[PDB]
Amino acid sequence: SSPGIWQLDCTHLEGKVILVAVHVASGYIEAEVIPAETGQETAYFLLKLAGRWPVKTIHTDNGSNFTSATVKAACDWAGIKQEDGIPYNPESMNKELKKIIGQVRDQAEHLKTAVQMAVFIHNKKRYSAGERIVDIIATD
């Protein structure tokens, strides 16, 4: 799997929306609770992702938040190729994420915090996805 390809999807919990980004080649994940599943929030999420990791292509679930012209603008600016409707086949990752969230939920006063704790655990769990993504992306 190309090192610049990310799978973009969503998942819901406690009446809240979580945007999920998975680095297909490593299984590394980035996720965050967002106010609403809108194009503006999705574009912002993508701009942050692209500025922290090499994002060359995103495969989305083709939800209306992704078909949004606002997201298209963000992708064009960041040089991201958007491919909608491409199923994840390296979400079952959403299940894993939800499972970990449950293991740390009572340690956080807010879901948003628990989600980040779950991402941390997932990425550092043993080679870990975190170690894998850096080894794959490293240029020198």
Ligand X SMILES: Cc1nc2ccccc2c(-c2ccc(Cl)cc2)c1[C@H](OC(C)(C)C)C(=O)O
Which positions make up the binding site for Mg(2+)? 9, 61, 91
Pairing of strands 57-60, 28-34: unpaired
**Closest approach of a copy of itself to the CB of residue 87, in Å:** 26
Among a copy of itself, ligand X, none, what does residue 69 contact (CB within 5–8 Å per kind)?
A: ligand X
CB-CB neighbours of 97 under 10 Å = 23
Among a copy of itself, ligand X, none, what does residue 137 contact (CB within 5–8 Å per kind)?
A: a copy of itself
Residue 44 touching ligand X (CB under 6 A) = yes
C-alpha 138/C-alpha 140 separation (Å) is 6
CB-CB neighbours of 68 under 10 Å = 17
Which is nearest to 19 in space by CA: 124, 139, 112, 125? 112
From candidates 77, 85, 87, 95, binder to a copy of itself by CB under 8 A: 77
Nearer to a copy of itself, 106 or 140 (CB): 140
